[PDB]
Amino acid sequence: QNNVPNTFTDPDSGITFNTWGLDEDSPQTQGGFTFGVALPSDALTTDASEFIGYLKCARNDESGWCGISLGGPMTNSLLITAWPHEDTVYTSLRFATGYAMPDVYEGDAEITQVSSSVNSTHFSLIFRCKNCLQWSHGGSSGGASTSGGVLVLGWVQAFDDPGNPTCPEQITLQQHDNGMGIWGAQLNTDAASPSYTDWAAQATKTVTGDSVVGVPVPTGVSFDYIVVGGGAGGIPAADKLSEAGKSVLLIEKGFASTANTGGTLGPEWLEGHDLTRFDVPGLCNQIWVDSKGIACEDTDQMAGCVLGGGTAVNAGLWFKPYSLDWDYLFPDGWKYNDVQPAINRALSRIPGTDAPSTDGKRYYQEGFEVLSKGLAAGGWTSVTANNAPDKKNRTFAHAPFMFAGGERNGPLGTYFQTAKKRNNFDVWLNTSVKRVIREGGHITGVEVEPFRDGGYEGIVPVTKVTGRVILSAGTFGSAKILLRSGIGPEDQLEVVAASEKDGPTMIGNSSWINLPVGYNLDDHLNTDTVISHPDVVFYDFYEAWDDPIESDKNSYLESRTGILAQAAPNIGPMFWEEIVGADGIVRQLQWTARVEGSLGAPNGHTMTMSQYLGRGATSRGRMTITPSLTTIVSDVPYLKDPNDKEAVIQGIINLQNALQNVANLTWLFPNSTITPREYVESMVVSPSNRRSNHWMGTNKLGTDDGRKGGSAVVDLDTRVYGTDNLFVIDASIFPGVPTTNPTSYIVVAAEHASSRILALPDLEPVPKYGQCGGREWTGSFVCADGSTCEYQNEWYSQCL
Numbered sequence: 141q142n143n144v145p146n147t148f149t150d151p152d153s154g155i156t157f158n159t160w161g162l163d164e165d166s167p168q169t170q171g172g173f174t175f176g177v178a179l180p181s182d183a184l185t186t187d188a189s190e191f192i193g194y195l196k197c198a199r200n201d202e203s204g205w206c207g208i209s210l211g212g213p214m215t216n217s218l219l220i221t222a223w224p225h226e227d228t229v230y231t232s233l234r235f236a237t238g239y240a241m242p243d244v245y246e247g248d249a250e251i252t253q254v255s256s257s258v259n260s261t262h263f264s265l266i267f268r269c270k271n272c273l274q275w276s277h278g279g280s281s282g283g284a285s286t287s288g289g290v291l292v293l294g295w296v297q298a299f300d301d302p303g304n305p306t307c308p309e310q311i312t313l314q315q316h317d318n319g320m321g322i323w324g325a326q327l328n329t330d331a332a333s334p335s336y337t338d339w340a341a342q343a344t345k346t347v348t349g350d351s352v353v354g355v356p357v358p359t360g361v362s363f364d365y366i367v368v369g370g371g372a373g374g375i376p377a378a379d380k381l382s383e384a385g386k387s388v389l390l391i392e393k394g395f396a397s398t399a400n401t402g403g404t405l406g407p408e409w410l411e412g413h414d415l416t417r418f419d420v421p422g423l424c425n426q427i428w429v430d431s432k433g434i435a436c437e438d439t440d441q442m443a444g445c446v447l448g449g450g451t452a453v454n455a456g457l458w459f460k461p462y463s464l465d466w467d468y469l470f471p472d473g474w475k476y477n478d479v480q481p482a483i484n485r486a487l488s489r490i491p492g493t494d495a496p497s498t499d500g501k502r503y504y505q506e507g508f509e510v511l512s513k514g515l516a517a518g519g520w521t522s523v524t525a526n527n528a529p530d531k532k533n534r535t536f537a538h539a540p541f542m543f544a545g546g547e548r549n550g551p552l553g554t555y556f557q558t559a560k561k562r563n564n565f566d567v568w569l570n571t572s573v574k575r576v577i578r579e580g581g582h583i584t585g586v587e588v589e590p591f592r593d594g595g596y597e598g599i600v601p602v603t604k605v606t607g608r609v610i611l612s613a614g615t616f617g618s619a620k621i622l623l624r625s626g627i628g629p630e631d632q633l634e635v636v637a638a639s640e641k642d643g644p645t646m647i648g649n650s651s652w653i654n655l656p657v658g659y660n661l662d663d664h665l666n667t668d669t670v671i672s673h674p675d676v677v678f679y680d681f682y683e684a685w686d687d688p689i690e691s692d693k694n695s696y697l698e699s700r701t702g703i704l705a706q707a708a709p710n711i712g713p714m715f716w717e718e719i720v721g722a723d724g725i726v727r728q729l730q731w732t733a734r735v736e737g738s739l740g741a742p743n744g745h746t747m748t749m750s751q752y753l754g755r756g757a758t759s760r761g762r763m764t765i766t767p768s769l770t771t772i773v774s775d776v777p778y779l780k781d782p783n784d785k786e787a788v789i790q791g792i793i794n795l796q797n798a799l800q801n802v803a804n805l806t807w808l809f810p811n812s813t814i815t816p817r818e819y820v821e822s823m824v825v826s827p828s829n830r831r832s833n834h835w836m837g838t839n840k841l842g843t844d845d846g847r848k849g850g851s852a853v854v855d856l857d858t859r860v861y862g863t864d865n866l867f868v869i870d871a872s873i874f875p876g877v878p879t880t881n882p883t884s885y886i887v888v889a890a891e892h893a894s895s896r897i898l899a900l901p902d903l904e905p906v907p908k909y910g911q912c913g914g915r916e917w918t919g920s921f922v923c924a925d926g927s928t929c930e931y932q933n934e935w936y937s938q939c940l
């Protein structure tokens with residue numbers, strides 16, 4: 141939709157609105173969308189509580205529905221839902237913690253109606269929302285301030301119609317397949333009217349209507365290592381541990397993904413050759429249109445919960461690490477010279493490929509040829525991505541992948557395969573870990589509950605004394621486990637205490653460790669741009685799911701070759717440049733070109749280039765947790781430091797200087813009339829639109845003790861401060877986001893950290909009368925036999 145509002149007068153009720161919305165034939169939503177607001181008189185100065193609004197929604201083949209997010213993200217915001225049934229339009233206010241079925245809003249809000257109009261192609265509405273702007277649901281409290289002059293809103297539309305469209309509260313829905321978006325909505329002189337109460341009392345309508353399998357833990361079972369989660373860092377770590385001969389258990393909350401992991405689920409034409417939906421690179425883009433049973437429901441962001449984690453559902457981009465990243469982002473011992481052997485071990489398993497097709501050819505390069513030769517004339521040098529990892533400035537290349545055999549490979553096809561064939565390695569799927577149970581600073585076992593049927597219920601102990609637990613659960617995952625284990629900031633630990641789920645069963649206050657868990661939240665800032673060229677050829681990977689092209693289908697199913705052997709959409713040239721700020725700090729930009737429509741530009745002749753803001757970004761956010769025990773982003777990391785925004789703008793400036801030599805090339809986003817500065821600042825800054833989906837830094841690696849008021853969570857051994865046997869290997873430990881897409885960096889970190897943990901001497905229990913604990917205490921937290929750990933004060937604990 142349109143940013144600058146539009147004054148619109150509805151004749152019958154005589155009510156005035158400020159209307160934003162899209163149109164019928166715009167390549168965003170089918171049937172168009174329009175929304176508006178009627179506020180109180182004082183709204184533009186002091187915040188309004190209730191309001192009045194106008195909904196014009198699409199109806200496709202006499203079927204559909206639409207929704208409004210008042211906060212504008214789907215998660216943790218008050219949602220308005222409307223669908224036609226016969227003449228009557230129905231409304232149910234909902235609330236959604238993660239990406240999933242929103243539950244009925246339990247707050248004080250109420251909907252009343254003025255007018256109802258339903259025809260074949262459309263159903264409109266004029267209603268009144270009371271106590272809607274300020275909302276509270278189950279401990280979560282949101283709000284919308286009309287005082288600022290702008291209102292961030294969000295919208296959806298759909299084709300199918302809900303489960304029975306009679307009772308608003310009990311309806312069932314599926315993912316909205318027509319359109320979605322977030323836009324800042326500005327208000328003006330016509331938003332606030334003195335007649336508001338005559339219009340408010342004019343709404344006379346109140347619309348009416350009419351467990352999991354618990355399989356227990358085996359008897360005498362214990363493990364030298366328990367690795368939680370099968371993600372990017374988990375599978376490589378558990379593999380190297382099992383290689384050493386240690387008895388290792390890998391606990392994954394999801395199910396089998398790729399066909400070599402025992403996978404089943406996949407499209408219709410993949411039946412019989414052992415290919416799943418995850419294995420085919422051309423079908424990788426379907427995770428956006430289908431999240432069912434895959435995406436994590438406990439996070440407000442998007443993360444794959446299946447086996448392999450993000451590596452299963454991602455594009456598969458795999459890069460050889462820039463040496464400057466490890467030097468800049470990490471302390472001594474994690475630097476480049478230190479992680480050099482880790483890089484060699486990781487790339488020997490998964491060497492990069494810039495030609496994913498098994499015949500060593502690239503397909504539909506028409507889009508690539510336009511930008512490549514254009515950037516070459518722009519003064520940018522062409523390189524092979526993994527043959528020159530250390531040239532990131534003014535340069536481009538083909539997209540390297542973790543693929544091989546023409547299929548999605550990753551840690552699933554290398555690290556996991558060698559792991560599954562050993563004796564000492566074991567995997568528990570459909571099983572989520574609630575917490576780690578611990579006495580003082582020593583973890584005994586982990587507490588599991590089934591996420592699905594065939595899951596495990598109980599407590600599985602580590603080998604006595606020596607046993608170690610590794611948290612691979614991920615950026616949001618590992619932080620949630622630590623918080624329910626009594627480890628983290630005070631405010632968040634008290635949230636877990638007041639929760640219904642973990643409330644009565646939580647550990648004692650005296651055992652709480654205070655670490656900045658959830659802080660140092662970072663990510664690549666994403667800024668999309670769109671160009672249009674006559675020579676660019678679009679390929680549809682979405683219709684390839686149900687009905688693949690005859691040629692290309694047989695090409696992949698036989699020789700594992702063709703356009704379906706490539707990621708979706710077709711990923712064009714990747715170029716980087718390093719920008720020096722006024723603060724002296726070098727910030728890294730990475731552009732990713734692909735052939736698709738993005739911002740509402742048509743698909744065929746257009747290419748989208750996404751700009752990631754990498755290493756050098758000083759801005760940080762924070763991850764918190766709800767009493768529902770769901771992970772949300774309380775503070776958005778992007779664009780805090782003003783010097784970060786300057787780097788983004790300059791990147792667009794220099795890119796336009798390089799690509800302006802190209803004939804017939806057209807810039808859709810931004811248009812020719814908008815300067816790159818005006819285009820960046822007029823954009824909305826939110827986790828939804830601006831995320832690159834790469835999340836790192838919730839548990840920070842550093843030498844500065846977090847208990848002493850430092851920023852670190854885990855030390856240089858990736859071990860949690862205040863604990864001898866607990867370790868964390870995943871993207872969460874990265875102090876900042878690297879130059880490039882993080883997956884390859886995380887697997888390397890897994891290789892490096894696993895080597896350190898193995899090298900560590902076995903834990904030796906503290907003898908009687910010794911000091912087993914303290915808030916400054918480094919050493920062994922476990923007491924010798926015949927002795928227990930007694931808490932005196934925060935600074936001291938003794939073996940007795």
Ligand SMILES: Cc1cc2nc3c(=O)[nH]c(=O)nc-3n(C[C@H](O)[C@H](O)[C@H](O)COP(=O)(O)OP(=O)(O)OC[C@H]3O[C@@H](n4cnc5c(N)ncnc54)[C@H](O)[C@@H]3O)c2cc1C
Pocket residue numbers: 368369370371372373374391392393394427442443444445446447448449450451453454455456457458571572573574612613614615617618621833834835870871872880881882883884886
């Ligand atoms: C769609 C998508 C596109 C992306 N594109 C790329 C790309 O092309 N290339 C690239 O470099 N990066 C890409 N990434 C980013 C990358 O996938 C992640 O940053 C990376 O996987 C992080 O790894 P992790 O181990 O820290 O977390 P994850 O990979 O998510 O691993 C966490 C695992 O733990 C499991 N789990 C979580 N909680 C629990 C629990 N409590 N108990 C038991 N198990 C649990 C989950 O099932 C999951 O399998 C993309 C990400 C997404 C989602």
Ligand code: HEM
Pocket residue numbers: 206207208209212213214215219220221234239240241242294295296313314315316320321322428429431435442828
């Ligand atoms: C059960 C039905 C629903 C499912 C399965 C669902 C799932 C999702 C998923 C997976 C995304 C992100 C997709 C992506 O990142 O590409 C999303 C985004 C969105 N959803 Fe929900 N949703 C549902 C119902 C709704 C409802 C009822 C509303 C509000 C009335 C809503 C508003 C939004 C908006 C505005 C976005 C885009 C902004 C954002 O990503 O947060 N959705 N939905």
Ligand SMILES: *[C@@H]1O[C@H](CO)[C@@H](O)[C@H](O)[C@H]1NC(C)=O
Pocket residue numbers: 395568569570592593594595
């Ligand atoms: C996990 O659940 C899936 C479906 O929910 C099932 O197909 C699979 O067999 C289960 N795995 C185990 C180990 O129970």
Ligand SMILES: *[C@@H]1O[C@H](CO)[C@@H](O)[C@H](O)[C@H]1NC(C)=O
Pocket residue numbers: 630649650651652653654934
């Ligand atoms: C126990 O709770 C209090 C506040 O209720 C908090 O100040 C204290 O730090 C907690 N104990 C520990 C060991 O953190």
Ligand SMILES: *[C@@H]1O[C@H](CO)[C@@H](O)[C@H](O)[C@H]1NC(C)=O
Pocket residue numbers: 533534718719720726
């Ligand atoms: C990258 O190259 C450009 C062009 O030569 C130069 O202006 C810029 O300073 C370089 N960046 C760094 C970090 O050296």
Ligand SMILES: *[C@@H]1O[C@H](CO)[C@@H](O)[C@H](O)[C@H]1NC(C)=O
Pocket residue numbers: 811812813814
């Ligand atoms: C300039 O941008 C506006 C709004 O984004 C758009 O309506 C207009 O079409 C653009 N200009 C051109 C020439 O397309």
Ligand SMILES: *[C@H]1O[C@H](CO)[C@@H](O)[C@H](O)[C@@H]1O
Pocket residue numbers: 334335336338
């Ligand atoms: C709304 O209605 C009032 C009367 O209550 C008018 O005075 C105003 O101009 C607007 O039409």
Ligand SMILES: *[C@H]1O[C@H](CO)[C@@H](O)[C@H](O)[C@@H]1O
Pocket residue numbers: 334335336337338
């Ligand atoms: C509704 O109520 C307000 C409250 O004063 C009036 O100003 C308005 O004219 C209408 O009667």
Ligand SMILES: *[C@H]1O[C@H](CO)[C@@H](O)[C@H](O)[C@@H]1O
Pocket residue numbers: 254341342343344345
């Ligand atoms: C409730 O009453 C109003 C008049 O105040 C009507 O306009 C409306 O259609 C509903 O019957």
Ligand SMILES: *[C@H]1O[C@H](CO)[C@@H](O)[C@H](O)[C@@H]1O
Pocket residue numbers: 344345346347
């Ligand atoms: C419809 O029903 C609600 C019930 O709360 C009333 O408040 C409203 O005035 C209308 O009668």
Ligand SMILES: *[C@H]1O[C@H](CO)[C@@H](O)[C@H](O)[C@@H]1O
Pocket residue numbers: 358359360
């Ligand atoms: C626990 O008990 C089982 C039988 O239920 C044994 O097989 C196992 O070795 C352990 O003693």
